[PDB]
Amino acid sequence: RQRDIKDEVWDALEEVIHGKVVLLNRAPTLHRLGIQAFQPVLVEGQSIQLHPLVCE
Amino acid sequence: AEPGIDKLFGMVDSKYRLTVVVAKRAQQLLRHRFKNTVLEPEERPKMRTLEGLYDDPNAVTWAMKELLTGRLFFGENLVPEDRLQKEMERLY
Amino acid sequence: FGKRQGEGFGVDKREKEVLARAEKLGLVSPGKSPEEQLKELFDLGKVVLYDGRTGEPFEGPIVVGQMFIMKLYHMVEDKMHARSTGPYSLITQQPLG
Amino acid sequence: ITQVRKEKKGAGMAFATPEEALAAYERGEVALNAPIVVAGRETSVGRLKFVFANPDEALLAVAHGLLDLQDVVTVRYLGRRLETSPGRILFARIVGEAVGDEKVAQELIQMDV
Amino acid sequence: QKRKLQVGDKLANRHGNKGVVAKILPVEDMPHLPDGTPVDVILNPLGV
Amino acid sequence: LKAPVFTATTQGDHYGEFVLEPLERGFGVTLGNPLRRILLSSIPGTAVTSVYIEDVLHEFSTIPGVKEDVVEIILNLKELVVRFLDPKMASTTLILRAEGPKEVRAGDFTPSADVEIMNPDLHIATLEEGGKLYMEVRVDRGVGYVPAERHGIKDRINAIPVDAIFSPVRRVAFQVEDTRLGQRTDLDKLTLRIWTDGSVTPLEALNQAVAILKEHLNYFANPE
Amino acid sequence: LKAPVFTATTQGDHYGEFVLEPLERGFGVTLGNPLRRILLSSIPGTAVTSVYIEDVLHEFSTIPGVKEDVVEIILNLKELVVRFLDPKMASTTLILRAEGPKEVRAGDFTPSADVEIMNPDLHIATLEEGGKLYMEVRVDRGVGYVPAERHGIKDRINAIPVDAIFSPVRRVAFQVEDTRLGQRTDLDKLTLRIWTDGSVTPLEALNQAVAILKEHLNYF
Amino acid sequence: AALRDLDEEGIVRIGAEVKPGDILVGRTSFKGEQEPSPEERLLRSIFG
């Protein structure tokens, strides 16, 4: 129940993260570019950020 | 991109064939006992995160970087796919 | 401009300087002291302005003006569905449960 | 950070800095065409250096209420006497710092446009 | 649910300009009008 | 020259333009612009945090003989500030025998001292015959912004949390002249104008601000 | 925790790259950005200011047996920088009767000592045959930048006045990246690279920039 | 306590803050779909 974990846990998830990577698709899709996939890191709050160019 | 990535793609016969090798000398690597890679001193990558450090549990990157020590070959060598475990005792 | 001119100041290095380019830029007419010029800038363009970052000025007759902001329905906390195995549906034997 | 800028102010004349150059800095004329023997008005500020780690002046020149980073036009110094302004030399530097030794940048890049 | 406005919701005006919150700023930053008043909202050109 | 002159036209408890006349063609903003950051950003300000009512269950819920509506209420309570004499005081409570028809506003709460309410009028309610309102508001002192996360628990029940605002100051800027004497007419004449103050006199704000823009501005000396 | 961590990479005499890790969504530039404006601006620096070579008449004129032409000379002389040993020496002069057909440089100057010239090599001038090049060159100490407005009179006539770059610095910027380590990812990572030197190691620049950044607030 | 305090008697009093997974209207249902487990029994008592 969202027992506001935070404490050191977060300080760990980045051992699942760290180095590894994930994807990223789009609706619709008419280019293999359509996925790419980036490594990860994390700021705050919901909604996911992405680097410009890819935008195109 | 990938650390040294440029020294990869070409130093092979073609893209995939590379990536391939990599993800093998990974599980086989770390996943078959962390202490296995060719690297010796500190050239072994680390993760100086928060306050403490440690070898990135993301094995996958060792291999990438492991392909930078003359050691290790790749190709139709030693047909005993099983015997790849012949070492599975010498490294326990 | 009134307030400030009767409150404390009227034309400052920063607030002034810009006006420089304002000319070279192809805007302000080389006229009276920084008053007149600083004006015009107003009218259409917007008064000086600086930057809470470095603190410098924003070299250019920036634009400003209360307008209108709506914030439609498509929020986020409502348009999001993250998960793992979670679903696992039957008959379909594919996620959705 | 480019687009020349030629705001055009005139086309008086000069005899190599004594007059015009010196005088003119009171009004009339500026980063225009002019002439002292074969040059325009890329002068006043020499800003030099060597193929080291800083033409110094340039960036440091505008650093103060001096030159206008936007293509104002001073005389650069990197491989050899450069016309360009910091409104362009900078370009290199960054794209340079990327790979190393602006040397390369030079070729590749287009600065004469 | 007393909603709010975190980081993602759509803003848009009356002439066509769909928002998409970027990274709300903590006062200090912003465009400080010569008389303190910072610019509550931006909306860089280009796009539409 | 050498040492500049610090001026100080403190009206009294709010606003207090400050001057640093003999400066150079470089510390213009270098000096104060950063300050402003410090000010707004972080300072021991104060504000509410936890309220309550009686016949009221929760925020998004109405009140009889009260046109306001809870929401409304706090949304008026929010901008109410106060001052606390002594540093011991961590944060106190406030009450209010709001009764029967009247106008109802701030200073009509507990006549306690030790904590003065620099806000008078501050239209709080408006009841007309539905007399009843006795409430339990908990004021706090912090630094920043902290909404629905820090529930000023207290009564623990219908005790509605609030959106802490803290921050003592609001609206601050400064101009920069062009000649405070010396020679080089290019000198700079600093002039900040700390517009307003919750409880802390314009002054303090400065010192306060400084102290910090300095303290943290220290570690620079020990490498690694 | 509460107290940040002040790193230091120091690669020697120039360049340093410093780091303040633990920060806060606020003091990103609020601490650092203003520093630069105290580095470049002020600081006890030093550089040339007035040179003169007989046989010369002007800055944009030419010199026999010397490919490098006046302009060129100074344009190389500018970048030269030296240290004075005892704060009672306003500025001093340099000299360099020099070679007929060799590769002149800096050191070749007057073997004096109080002031040392960090910069050996430093091209200076080629001069096949046309041996002749004894030259007066006044070196100064100052603060920021001052070009053709200071003069460095001295010899008066023909004594060409040069741009004064006396800032022991050059081209400095920084960074700022939102991390989390503590907890709120939004936290900022400093990073200031004092890309430079002109005698003073990167380091000193800092504590010599901060002693002042501190100094003025005092006045309050 | 996660229950009995807030919910209680099924319905949960008005003016209660709720977060993910928080029971809204707890319920029962007799139901016996997957009867007794093996080792699990080694627990149903182990703790009692």
PDB file of C-alpha atoms in Angstrom, chain F residues 223-224, chain G residues 6-7:
ATOM      1  CA  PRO F 223      39.511  19.547  -1.710  1.00  0.00           C
ATOM      2  CA  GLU F 224      39.747  15.744  -1.833  1.00  0.00           C
TER       3      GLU F 224
ATOM      4  CA  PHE G   6      34.051  19.264  -2.018  1.00  0.00           C
ATOM      5  CA  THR G   7      36.019  17.245  -4.547  1.00  0.00           C
TER       6      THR G   7
END
